[PDB]
Ligand binder design. Structure first.
Ligand code: CLA
Ligand code: CLA
Ligand code: CLA
Ligand code: CLA
Ligand code: CLA
Ligand code: CLA
Ligand code: CLA
Ligand code: CLA
Ligand SMILES: CC1=C(/C=C/C(C)=C/C=C/C(C)=C/C=C/C=C(C)/C=C/C=C(C)/C=C/C2=C(C)CCCC2(C)C)C(C)(C)CCC1
Ligand SMILES: CC1=C(/C=C/C(C)=C/C=C/C(C)=C\C=C/C=C(C)/C=C/C=C(C)/C=C/C2=C(C)CCCC2(C)C)C(C)(C)CCC1
Ligand SMILES: CC1=C(/C=C/C(C)=C/C=C/C(C)=C\C=C\C=C(C)\C=C\C=C(C)\C=C\C2=C(C)CCCC2(C)C)C(C)(C)CCC1
Lengths: 193, 733, 154, 42, 97, 80, 66, 30
């Protein structure tokens, strides 16, 4: 139960992975919408779980933060740098056409499959190590993925809001600024200018 | 049938004079004619559309002919800022010699009227230069009028009359209207701009004879197909440029400068060509949305069926709306009139702020006349839109086929809608009137510092958002660090920011508390007019006082004196009531516009700024003050050219007042009076040798509402037109 | 300042208005004996004028080029005295009146002849109910939550 | 006596008394606190 | 920069996507959305003589059913994207970061 | 002539007939109410459309309806 | 057996053209004679626009409400 | 010269003819 003392919704019995009874707006009242929401929630969770380290790790290294790493495309002759290497295809129209064709193909492949249970957990080629072996352990891994991904989503929100509250920052730069003086470096200064 | 009107046997059998009147007022209501069918309905409408188009072409042809044959056009082109244009000549055998003298002006041989329609600036801007060009135009339009009559006649004979199924093919008509009627027409117009109008702007006279020899651009066609279009934006006209000349002339045919031409004070012709080209592309690509004969496209019905929110807060959503609208010509006319009224006001608001015609912004009588013109047109069009919403609810609306969709739910909670429009109108009315009256009392007691003057800080903040510096809010486009400012610095922003911060033009005029108050009066008028019309449409099928109203039709006198009294209970009566409020609202709008500009044009902006915050200021410093030249158009000491506006000014005052008769006196009084008159005629020797063929009766109840509203409106419009034109043109500034 | 205005304490036009007003009243004052009652009245109007302009200058009102106060209703915290604060006062009083009238109508609605107390006021009941308006925001909020504020299925 | 209090409770009379009191109040408030475009006490 | 290159690439990629990628989606949507109909029946059955769709042109010996109309639609897209990239490359426009 | 109709909500109080100033309406036998009578409009060619009958009906909603229609010398109340 | 609702019962008016539509009224007497098309007699707290406070309704036009 | 022909033509002759003709059509009995 997400909120002790609160009656769980009628349609949330706790059986689903990551189902703690949280839908205060009753957005899953219709079952079709709820299933679609489980799929989409997992998609966001996995994009976030991939994108958070892609945001943090290049910052720990000498490379720019996640904001600076997008900046060459604003200027016309822009060329990307992967690990300091001016990659030749780094021009914006190149990687842009590449990204459109590749992403569009893959994601549209997800659009043209309706199991619907495979739209959440397809497996097969995407489970070569076969972690779907024990359905108990596979379901516990479902709770694992859902909580990890929700955590990553919250973290991403923290990164975007910190970026708005300190334009041209880094999550770890913000963290270090806090570690300097935690009692005088806080969200309190942003909430209260 | 058996006599006029042949379309109504019930009217032809009327022995009274009513038969004639109602024969006229019902001639176009085809659905009420005897033996009407759907096919006859659609076919009569279609032919009527061709007839209208023919009227429009013939009218513009007449304007062209008269400017060419009696006007100043050729002389006006050489000196746009010192030649009064000529509408047409005056041949009136009632003129005394002083009228012949005083109306002879504009450098003409006899009395003439100065045109305030602004067709000289338009035709000059689009490339017309000689009276010969105008004659070619007029004959071309007379030709088009004739072919309109020809097609309308043609589609009334069988095998040329279309089936109703063809009229109800909505997807095809939308594809052709978007892609062809909107898109291709706009594209061709861009053609005329780059081939004729822009050359004429650079000194080149391009006509049908030589337009194949001349290139529109030195490199043209080739940079278009290569995909390097910027070569067309390359060499624009110089900021020092003379419009009829090659001085400062560039070669660019498509630009996005953003401001005005410094000489003509109007939009850049290359800007306008680029505009019509781009929106033409948008209409072309957008006109491929719906499905016809090729196995691709949308079923509008299916899209409407699909847009039903889960959770059911809109019930069944938009299901059944495709047939509800496609089967109801009144629904279609309502949507068309609503949209057309919005964009008519939009035209009014954008043509005074962003003038598109050379040397039109300096002609102040024309700018005022056009703004007033289009705002009143827009008002009437809006009232009509709601009228046909109501007529839809009565004649075409099928409750079972719209069950629990959004449209039926409008009726289902009509009391919340009507009651909240009533609340908004009461709040706006109480407080706008209250603040005006407070300020008037303060100025009466000599304490202007006690007024309630609220800064229109939200609109001011929007003007700052546009880059106006008058208020120092330092927001986007008004601020240096704004991404919105950086993104457009290289394109339109230099010309735009240049134009908005020029103090002479009407581009986002500076606003103060006087503008706050009138804007809230305008809000009041929109809300009250809308309240009347919406209540009329939603109560057209019935109320608690008349639950069976749908069975009585759109227009009926009333339901008798029972149940408390029921006068003006029909939907038509709600329209009739709302027209008064529309005339009031557009009166406030146009008073506002004309006073703000007439003070701007005099360099005396302060007079508006200080005097518009109390109503005596409007009465004394606007109407009373600017009637001075008008009311002296003729007097015991002589006449001048303003006499026609003085006369008309009273004419309106008369017609308006005559309307009051039909609106205050009701029928029974006149019916008894006419009975005494019938007795008088029959008992008078020599005269009783003459007998009436139609029994004289008093006008109908509804008929009197209409006749009185028409007098009220004609007097309204003619009065304000006389004052507007005389007060501006008399000063010309 | 805000909207291009200037504080009335810094406005030349504002001080010119105060000057011209006072000199006008003094022009009227020159006609009467200084001991007379018209004289004392014009002096009282003069003192009231000075009090007026001095107070508008003190409390931070911005002026236009007209030399007259303009009110900032945007919500800017420097000008809550010009709208937001008198506005909250108004909403308190209006809510009081309407809440009391509603209390009266509910109180008489089950009487044998309700209209009888609408044309002849039950003043004892009214006096009992007038001071419910003091706590009208709590009462109306509690009714909104409890479902007693809005009639069911209307 | 009872009938007279009843008459004095009738709509127009109660209205004149009520608005007359309100008018005296507002007049005196504008007498001790004249002019005032704002709530100055903040 | 080369118009033939960009137009050929964009149009070839558009035809390709419409042929091997988005074809099934296209067909299931144009099938479930179906022909426009007035009063519960198609415009042609309702009596519009010119509302009969053209089944001759829609027949194609292309195995999957890709026909002239598909060519026209997707090729139109490819040319609009193509002239978009062409016109946008010769701009010289650059936003101030 | 104006159309006049009666609806079976009629309770047969006779007031529409009593109110009519041109004698358009009658009371005919019927079994649907206690008064065992229902109104009728057999002479609408004399109907002038004043709706005194409608003012007289106690039924909610009305059981007489006057639908003003094609005008005649009789419906316009002309004595000339 | 008695037809219609009990006398004194509160009923909701379902006749759409009734002034008291979706309101309530008290039952007075239900005429047990069949062939009477509108046997239910309802009295109302408020007069309608004809200053009438009672009206007869059909059995399917009244809905007993407590 | 031409206005001296067409102003009375459409301001006198045309309204007289149109009013008389419309009068006849409107008073006709079939
Ligand atoms: C339809 C727009 C229109 C308008 C509003 C006017 C308005 C006017 N015209 Mg003009 N006129 C027009 C078109 C128009 N004209 C056209 C297309 C031609 C042929 C090129 C003329 C040729 C013309 C001449 C020669 C003269 C006028 C004159 C006049 C003025 C006096 C009225 C008159 O003499 O009757 C108008 C005379 C006509 C011949 C007009 C008929 C022309 C076409 C065929 C109109 C169709 C009429 C049709 C039978 C009825 C349709 C009703 C309506 C919609 C037109 C007047 C201000 C006189 C003037 O200037 O006085 C100072 C004058 O001498 N007009
Ligand atoms: C100066 C002319 C005038 C005025 C003041 C009004 C006033 C009003 N009309 Mg009206 N109207 C007019 C002309 C006018 N109309 C004409 C010519 C027509 C054509 C017949 C219409 C037709 C019409 C329709 C069809 C409708 C209105 C509506 C309204 C109300 C609109 C809401 C509002 O503004 O809040 C109130 C605004 C006011 C200006 C009220 C002014 C009086 C204040 C309250 C004085 C306060 C009393 C003060 C203490 C003095 C007491 C005196 C003492 C002896 C008791 C409003 C009361 C609409 C409506 O009802 O809105 C809900 C509506 O539907 N009007
Ligand atoms: C404070 C008490 C608490 C407790 C009782 C648990 C207990 C548990 N957690 Mg949780 N967790 C906690 C705090 C806690 N966590 C907090 C504060 C966060 C925020 C970062 C998380 C986020 C988290 C994630 C991301 C995951 C778990 C998971 C798990 C379960 C897996 C344990 C295991 O090793 O595999 C047996 C286990 C029952 C995993 C799971 O899915 O549960 C099956 C998993 O992936 N937890
Ligand atoms: C594309 C626009 C459009 C279209 C095609 C229609 C179509 C129709 N309307 Mg609509 N309507 C419109 C716009 C439109 N209207 C607008 C803008 C308004 C607001 C003014 C209305 C308000 C409206 C109402 C209230 C009604 C209609 C009605 C009708 C129907 C019959 C009209 C008729 O036969 O009367 C024939 C018309 C005339 C004989 C015109 C004579 C009266 C005019 C107004 C006087 C002219 C002014 C004066 C002479 C100017 C000269 C002054 C002089 C000193 C110079 C018809 C289907 C009627 C209907 O059938 O309802 C179901 C109806 O009652 N319309
Ligand atoms: C490309 C093919 C095509 C084209 C060009 C048209 C064109 C037209 N049709 Mg048609 N239609 C078509 C296909 C087409 N249709 C097909 C295939 C069908 C069967 C499915 C129909 C069935 C149909 C019917 C039933 C009717 C029409 C009608 C019309 C006319 C509308 C009236 C009008 O003048 O508005 C013109 C519109 C514009 C000029 C563009 C919009 C104007 C904008 C919004 C406002 C002004 C813009 C700009 C600022 C102007 C500057 C002002 C300045 C120049 C002074 C119009 C000329 C109606 C008609 O009038 O009958 C004759 C009518 O009844 N159509
Ligand atoms: C419907 C509007 C319209 C029309 C009918 C024309 C017509 C014409 N134009 Mg024009 N043009 C237009 C719009 C239009 N243009 C616009 C909007 C622009 C601004 C970009 C131009 C700018 C332009 C230039 C710079 C030139 C022309 C030229 C020409 C002529 C030769 C065109 C040609 O064969 O190219 C080739 C056609 C094709 C390769 C097939 C096109 C496929 C269609 C569009 C689908 C021709 C008579 C040329 C000329 O000789 O001037 C007189 C010339 O140099 N045009
Ligand atoms: C108990 C008194 C009372 C209450 C609580 C309300 C409440 C409301 N009215 Mg109403 N109204 C009232 C009296 C009241 N009204 C009276 C006396 C009239 C006739 C003058 C009206 C006429 C009226 C109209 C025309 C409208 C409303 C509207 C509204 C609603 C929006 C608020 C508003 O516009 O206020 C506006 C208030 C007025 C116009 C007049 C109020 C009169 C005084 C200030 C209140 C009555 C005091 C009363 C005598 C107290 C008796 C004391 C008692 C203890 C003995 C709202 C629910 C609007 C609506 O429908 O909203 C959707 C709207 O259109 N009212
Ligand atoms: C909705 C319209 C409206 C509004 C917003 C105002 C607002 C105001 N007017 Mg104005 N006025 C109006 C209409 C309006 N008036 C009309 C229609 C007339 C003609 C009858 C006047 C004539 C008028 C005059 C002659 C004067 C004003 C004055 C004032 C100010 C007095 C403030 C005050 O009394 O101190 C504060 C009052 C209170 C705090 C009372 C509330 C406290 C209650 C009673 C008890 C609270 C207990 C907790 C005020 C800002 C006076 C002024 O000095 O202007 C600056 C003044 O001289 N008004
Ligand atoms: C009754 C009825 C009817 C009618 C109705 C009507 C008449 C309506 C109307 C209406 C109207 C008259 C409306 C209007 C509107 C508007 C809107 C809705 C707007 C829009 C907007 C926007 C969204 C914008 C935005 C923007 C931009 C784009 C840019 C700049 C800035 C801004 C923000 C401005 C019908 C027939 C249908 C049916 C039956 C019933
Ligand atoms: C036989 C065959 C084949 C081949 C095929 C081919 C080779 C194809 C072609 C196709 C194509 C190759 C097509 C194309 C194109 C199309 C279209 C349809 C187009 C278009 C265009 C447009 C539409 C344009 C527009 C515009 C303009 C005009 C102006 C401005 C600009 C723009 C863009 C807007 C294969 C082997 C594969 C397989 C087997 C069989
Ligand atoms: C802040 C501010 C502002 C704004 C405002 C707004 C935007 C608002 C909104 C508002 C709203 C949107 C509201 C609403 C409403 C709703 C509803 C739904 C209602 C209700 C009510 C009621 C229910 C009442 C009741 C009562 C009481 C409580 C008392 C008296 C009696 C009675 C019963 C009346 C401005 C800038 C201007 C100025 C500054 C400040």
């Amino acid at each position: 139960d997400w909120m002790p003392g609160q009656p769980r919704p009628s349609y949330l019995d706790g059986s689903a992975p990551g189902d703690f009874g949280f839908d205060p707006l009753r957005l899953g009242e219709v079952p079709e919408n709820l299933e679609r929401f489980k799929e989409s929630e997992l998609i966001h969770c996995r994009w976030a779980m991939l994108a958070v380290p892609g945001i943090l790790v290049p910052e720990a290294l000498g490379l720019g933060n996640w904001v600076k790493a997008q900046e060459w495309a604003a200027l016309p002759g822009g060329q990307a740098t992967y690990l300091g290497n001016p990659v030749p295809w780094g021009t914006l129209p190149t990687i842009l056409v590449i990204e459109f064709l590749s992403i569009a193909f893959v994601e549209h492949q997800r659009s043209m499959e309706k199991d619907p249970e495979k739209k959440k957990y397809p497996g097969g080629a995407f489970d070569p190590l076969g972690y779907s072996k024990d359905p108990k352990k596979f379901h516990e891994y479902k709770i694992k993925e859902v909580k990890n991904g929700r955590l990553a989503l919250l973290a991403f929100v923290g990164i975007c809001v910190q970026q708005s509250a300190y334009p041209g920052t880094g999550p770890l730069e913000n963290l270090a600024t806090h570690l300097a003086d935690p009692w005088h470096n806080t969200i309190g200064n942003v909430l209260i200018p | 049938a058996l006599r006029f009107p042949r379309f109504s046997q019930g009217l032809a059998q009327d022995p009274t004079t009513r038969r004639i009147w109602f024969g006229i007022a019902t001639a176009h209501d085809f659905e009420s004619h005897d033996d009407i069918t759907e096919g006859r309905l659609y076919q009569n409408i279609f032919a009527s559309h061709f007839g209208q188009l023919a009227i429009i072409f013939l009218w513009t042809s007449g304007n062209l002919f008269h400017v060419a044959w009696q006007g100043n056009f050729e002389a006006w082109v050489q000196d746009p800022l010192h030649v009064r244009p000529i509408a047409h000549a005056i041949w009136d055998p009632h003129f005394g010699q002083p009228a012949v003298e005083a109306f002879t002006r504009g450098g003409a041989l006899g009395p003439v009227n100065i045109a305030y329609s602004g067709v000289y600036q338009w035709w000059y801007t689009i490339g017309l230069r000689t009276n010969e060009d105008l004659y070619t135009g007029a004959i071309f339009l007379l030709f088009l009028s004739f072919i309109s009559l020809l097609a309308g006649w043609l589609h009334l004979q069988p095998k040329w009359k279309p089936s109703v199924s063809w009229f109800k093919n909505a997807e095809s008509r939308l594809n052709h209207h978007l892609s062809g009627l909107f898109g291709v027409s706009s594209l061709a117009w861009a053609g005329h701009l780059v081939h004729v109008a822009i050359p004429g702007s650079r000194g080149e006279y391009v006509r049908w004879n030589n337009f194949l020899s001349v290139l529109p651009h030195p490199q043209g066609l080739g940079p278009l197909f290569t995909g390097q279009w910027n070569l067309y934006a390359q060499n624009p006209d110089s900021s020092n440029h003379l419009f009829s000349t090659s001085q400062g002339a560039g070669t660019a045919i498509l630009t996005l400068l953003g401001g005005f031409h410094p000489q003509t004070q109007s939009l850049w012709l290359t800007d306008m060509a680029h505009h019509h080209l781009a929106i033409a592309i948008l209409f072309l690509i957008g006109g491929h949305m719906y499905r016809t004969n090729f196995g691709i496209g949308h079923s509008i019905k299916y899209i409407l069926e699909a847009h039903i929110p889960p959770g059911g807060r809109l019930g069944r959503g938009h299901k059944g709306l495709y047939d509800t609208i496609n089967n109801s010509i009144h629904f279609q006319l309502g949507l068309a009139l609503a949209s057309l009224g919005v964009i008519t006001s939009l035209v009014a608001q954008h043509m005074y702020s962003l003038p598109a015609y050379a040397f039109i912004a300096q002609d102040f009588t024309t700018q005022a006349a056009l703004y007033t013109h289009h705002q009143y047109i827009a008002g009437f069009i809006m009232t009509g839109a709601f009228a046909h919403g109501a007529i839809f609810f009565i004649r075409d609306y099928n409750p079972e086929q719209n069950a629990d969709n959004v449209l039926a739910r409008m009726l289902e909670h009509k009391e919340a809608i009507i009651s909240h429009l009533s609340w908004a109108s009461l709040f706006l009315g109480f407080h706008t009137l209250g603040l005006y009256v407070h300020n008037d009392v303060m100025l009466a007691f000599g304490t202007p510092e006690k007024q309630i003057l609220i800064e229109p800080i939200f609109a001011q903040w929007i003007q700052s958002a546009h880059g106006k510096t008058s208020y120092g809010f330092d927001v986007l486009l008004s601020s240096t660090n704004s991404p919105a400012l950086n993104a457009g610095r290289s394109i339109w922003l230099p010309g735009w920011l240049n134009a908005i911060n020029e103090n002479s033009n009407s581009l986002f005029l500076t606003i103060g508390p006087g503008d706050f108050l009138v804007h809230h009066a305008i809000a009041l008028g929109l809300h009250t007019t809308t309240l009347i019309l919406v209540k009329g449409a939603l109560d057209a099928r019935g109320s608690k006082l008349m639950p069976d109203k749908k069975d009585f039709g759109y227009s009926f006198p009333c339901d008798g004196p029972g149940r408390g009294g029921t006068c003006d209970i029909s939907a038509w009566d709600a329209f009739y009531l709302a027209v008064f409020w529309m005339l009031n609202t557009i009166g406030w709008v146009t008073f506002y516009w004309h006073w703000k500009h007439i003070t701007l044009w005099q360099g005396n902006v302060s007079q508006f700024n200080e005097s518009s915050t109390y109503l005596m200021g409007w009465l004394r410093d606007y109407l009373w003050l600017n009637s001075s030249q008008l009311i002296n158009g003729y007097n015991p000491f002589g006449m001048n050219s303003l006499s026609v506006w003085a006369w008309m000014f009273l004419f309106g005052h008369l017609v308006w007042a005559t309307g009051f008769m039909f609106l205050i006196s009701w029928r029974g009084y006149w019916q008894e009076l006419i009975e005494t008159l019938a007795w008088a005629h029959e008992r008078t020797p020599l005269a009783n040798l003459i007998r009436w063929r139609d029994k004289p009766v008093a006008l109908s109840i509804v008929q009197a509402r209409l006749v009185g509203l028409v007098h009220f409106s004609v007097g309204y419009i003619f009065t304000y037109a006389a004052f507007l034109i005389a007060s501006t043109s008399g000063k010309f500034g | 300042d805000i909207a291009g205005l200037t504080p009335c304490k810094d406005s030349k036009q504002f001080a010119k208005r105060e000057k011209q007003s006072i000199k006008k009243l003094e022009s009227s004052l020159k006609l009467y004996a200084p001991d007379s009652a018209p004289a004392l009245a014009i002096n009282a109007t003069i003192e009231k004028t000075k009090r007026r302009f001095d107070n508008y200058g003190k409390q931070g009102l911005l002026c236009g080029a007209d030399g007259l106060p303009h009110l900032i209703v945007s919500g800017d915290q420097r000008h809550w005295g010009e709208f937001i604060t008198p506005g909250i006062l108004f909403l308190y009083i209006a809510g009081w009146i309407g809440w009391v009238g509603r209390s009266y109508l509910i109180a008489i609605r089950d009487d044998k002849k309700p209209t009888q107390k609408e044309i002849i006021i039950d003043v004892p009941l009214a006096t009992r109910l007038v001071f419910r308006g003091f706590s009208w925001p709590i009462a109306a909020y509690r009714e909104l939550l409890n479902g007693e504020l809005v009639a069911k299925d209307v | 006596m009872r009938d007279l209090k009843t008459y004095l409770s009738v709509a127009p009379v109660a209205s004149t008394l009520w608005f007359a009191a309100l008018a005296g109040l507002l007049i005196e408030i504008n007498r001790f606190f004249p002019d005032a475009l704002t709530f100055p006490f903040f | 920069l080369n118009p033939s290159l960009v137009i050929s690439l964009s149009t070839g990629l558009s035809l390709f996507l419409g042929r091997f990628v988005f074809f099934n989606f296209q067909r299931e949507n144009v099938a479930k959305q179906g022909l426009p109909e007035q009063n519960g029946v198609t415009h042609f059955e309702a009596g519009d003589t010119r509302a009969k769709e053209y089944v001759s042109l829609l027949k194609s010996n292309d195995p999957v059913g890709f026909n002239i109309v598909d060519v026209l639609a997707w090729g139109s897209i490819g040319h609009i994207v193509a002239y978009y990239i062409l016109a946008t490359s010769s701009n010289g426009y650059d936003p101030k970061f | 002539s104006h159309s006049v109709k009666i609806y079976d909500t009629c309770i047969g109080c006779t007031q529409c007939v009593r109110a009519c100033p041109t004698d358009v309406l009658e009371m005919i036998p019927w079994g649907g109410c206690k008064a065992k009578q229902i109104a009728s409009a057999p002479r609408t060619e004399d109907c002038v459309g004043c709706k005194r009958c409608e003012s007289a009906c106690p039924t909610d909603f009305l059981s007489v309806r006057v639908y003003l229609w094609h005008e005649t010398t009789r419906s316009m109340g002309l004595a000339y | 057996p008695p037809i219609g609702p009990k006398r004194g019962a509160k009923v909701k008016i379902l006749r759409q053209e009734s002034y008291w539509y979706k309101g309530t009224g008290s039952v007075v007497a239900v005429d047990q004679d069949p062939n009477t098309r509108y046997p239910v007699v309802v009295r109302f707290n408020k007069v309608n626009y004809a200053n009438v406070s009672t009206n007869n309704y059909a059995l399917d036009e009244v809905e007993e409400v407590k | 010269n031409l206005p001296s022909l067409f102003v009375p033509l459409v301001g006198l002759l045309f309204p007289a003819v149109a009013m008389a003709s419309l009068f006849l059509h409107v008073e006709k009995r079939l």
